[PDB]
Amino acid sequence: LSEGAIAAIMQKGDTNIKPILQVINIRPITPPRYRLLMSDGLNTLSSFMLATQLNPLVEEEQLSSNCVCQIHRFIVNTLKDGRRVVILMELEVLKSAEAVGVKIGNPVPYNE
Amino acid sequence: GQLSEGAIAAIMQKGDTNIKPILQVINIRPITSPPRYRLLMSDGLNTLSSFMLATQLNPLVEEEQLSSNCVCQIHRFIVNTLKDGRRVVILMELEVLKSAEAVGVKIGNPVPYNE
Amino acid sequence: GQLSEGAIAAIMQKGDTNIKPILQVINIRPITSPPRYRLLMSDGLNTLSSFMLATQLNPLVEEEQLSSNCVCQIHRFIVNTLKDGRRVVILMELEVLKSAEAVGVKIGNPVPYNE
Amino acid sequence: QLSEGAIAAIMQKGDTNIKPILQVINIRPITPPRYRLLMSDGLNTLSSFMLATQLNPLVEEEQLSSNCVCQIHRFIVNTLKDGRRVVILMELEVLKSAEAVGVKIGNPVPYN
Amino acid sequence: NELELLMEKSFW
Amino acid sequence: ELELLMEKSFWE
Amino acid sequence: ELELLMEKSFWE
Amino acid sequence: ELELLMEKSFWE
DSSP states (O other): OOTTHHHHHHHTOOTTOOOEEEEEEEEEEOOOEEEEEEEOSSEEEEEEEEOGGGHHHHHTTSSOTTOEEEEEEEEEEEOTTSOEEEEEEEEEEEEOHHHHOSOOSOOEEOOO | OOSOTTHHHHHHHHOOOOOOOEEEEEEEEEEOOOOEEEEEEEOSSEEEEEEEEOGGGHHHHHTTSSOTTOEEEEEEEEEEEOTTSOEEEEEEEEEEEEOHHHHOSOOSOOEEOOO | OOSOTTHHHHHHHHOOOOOOOEEEEEEEEEEOOOOEEEEEEEOSSEEEEEEEEOGGGHHHHHTTSSOTTOEEEEEEEEEEEOTTSOEEEEEEEEEEEEOHHHHOSOOSOOEEOOO | OOOTTHHHHHHHHOOTTOOOEEEEEEEEEEOOOEEEEEEEOSSEEEEEEEEOGGGHHHHHTTSSOTTOEEEEEEEEEEEOTTSOEEEEEEEEEEEEOHHHHOSOOSOOEEOO | OTHHHHTSSOOO | OHHHHTSSOSOO | OHHHHHTSOSOO | OHHHHHTSOTTO
16 A cells, blocks of 8 residues: 555645555545545545545446455535545555455554 | 532542533543553543543544544542552443534633642 | 354454354353453354453443343454464454344354354 | 342342342444443453333433443243343333442453 | 243343 | 435435 | 453353 | 553553
8 A cells, every 4th residue: 555645645645646545435425425534554534535436446346345446537526624535536446345354554544 | 610619639539429510631642452541631620530430331432433623421430549548440331422623622720639 | 134144253363353153142151340341142143252342332231232132233342362272252343233132042053152 | 239140039039039230331222212222240351231211211311321230130931932131121220320329340251 | 822922021 | 416315324 | 351351161 | 552552651
């Protein structure tokens, strides 16, 4: 996993990286919108929203808890309260949830 | 009137566990095997960091239900007393009553527990 | 078909914790400070009494949620291997899926784990 | 002051002359409601207790609530189809309020 | 029934 | 759009 | 403390 | 376990 990528996105917002992340959980906000808890191996963060166009990846289970994916296109928006949210626009699942089988490492919540 | 003002002093002095105080989380820091989470908590009057989360509750932290500024009710805890006389609270069951998102800020002006 | 047949043998032999098996409680016995509960569990194929309940889960026993014949999913456990080679499972997190009343009977014909 | 060993005795032999002092651990309504009680004698706990309908005011006005200590003055024991024995509480006196006791007494274990 | 219903399910 | 989708906690 | 506990049979 | 955890300051 791209250890440090979550910190980097939150602190600099550099779109020009293509991080490898693990999906820890996916929760719908109810036409569903999917919010993801992602890990870079060091930190976890739930400030990830899936673009609607990528919903079939969730609904057909390609993207599910424990899978490993590479983010190819994302954008960072900052809310009024100053919190940053990542919108995922293009990604590829590198290893399925079934193949990985477990949470990788012991990531802790991004806290800076 | 949201927090159990005085509960921290009461636990540190009496050591009794037959209360279910409502507290605000100020900060959560991992000690790194799963991490063990240590919490700086407020009762509105005092703050203190002598709180350890039972590992069964790690999902509340990891899924961000329990985070800085949230208000929670402690349903079960245990007290242990160190050789040096410090009381440590192990949080065994808790319920988040109001999310960090909903509370938004530290409640009031608590000061470090100092007795 | 409701129980994770072969999970007990998997745990005893491989000792891996990356499974969340569904088991039936056959009996619970306290060793008596909070009591510590020891459990005789079934996976439908075998039974084994080398299970200890984490203290955090004691209220499930005391409130009768976890009782003889209930069906539960183990969400986290820890394996410990004794000097003599016997493995002990500490049940850390679990969910009761079906109450003892709902199940009503011992499921199937499990035999003691014997390898 | 709990009658340690009274629940085991009542479940074994049903001597209605035992006038046990018990602690209420919890009370659950089954939908007027019928109230089922998880009771403790300091040694064992057991939820096979139903409150007679006529005693519902004690629950509804909070005299009978979690942690209170009471004396059972009159009860009957019934046996269900599956052989389980259930105590019907017919007359009781609350000796000490939940507030005055403040805590679960002892470390009772389920009657087994 | 009667008492069977009150005891049909687990306490909690 | 995003403000509403993030006003809640990830887990209820 | 597991060693101590496991010195006894389940029922005994 | 607890003595070792509490040997360090909250912010380390």
